[PDB]
Copies of this chain bind each other. A is one copy, B any other.
Amino acid sequence: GSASQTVTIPCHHIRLGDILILQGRPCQVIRISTSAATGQHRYLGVDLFTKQLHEESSFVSNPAPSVVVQTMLGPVFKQYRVLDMQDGSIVAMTETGDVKQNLPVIDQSSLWNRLQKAFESGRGSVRVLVVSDHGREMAVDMKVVHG
C-alpha cells in the first residue's frame, strides 16, 4: 500500500483538529501559524499512527491569471461496517465484503467508548471512517448511517 489517497483542501478551509498530510503522513493539526520568512501558513500536527509531531507549510501556485491558490492535502477516508468489537480492535468489513479482523481504533476523543455505545444499539447502522496509509489502516472516527 502506497501513501494514503488524498483530496485538495483550500487553506481557508483548514481549522484546528483537521487531518492533513504533513511530511507525507496523516496528522491532526494542533497549530496553524504564519511563517515570518515566507508569509505562508505553517501547520503543526500529530501523526495519527506514531503520535510524533510534524510540520509542513503550504505554498502558492498560480493556475490562472489573478488566481492564487494555497492548499494542503487531506486523506480520503473510507467507510467500513462494524461487525464486532473485541478488546481495543474491531472486526470491520469494506463495502465489497472484505473482512478486516483486527482493525485498530485510534484513541482520540473517546472514539472507542462512543463506538461501542453505538454498536450495542444498532450494529448494522454503525460505520467507522478509516485512514489507510502505507499498508496501515485505522478507524479515526465513526458515523451511524443517516436517517
Contacts and interface: CB of A to CB of B under 8 A. Distances in A.
A53 interface: no
A79 interface: yes
A10 B7 CA distance: 8
Interface string A26-60: 00000000101111100000000000000000000
A107 interface: no
Q: How large is the interface on A (under 10, 10 to 19, 20 to 34, 35 or more residues)?
A: 20 to 34
A78 B15 CA distance: 22
Interface of A: 7-10, 12-15, 18, 34, 36-40, 62, 65-68, 74, 76, 78-80, 94-96, 130, 145-147
Q: What are the nearest 8 A-B pairs in CB distance?
A: A39-B146, A66-B95, A66-B78, A13-B13, A66-B94, A39-B147, A68-B79, A65-B95
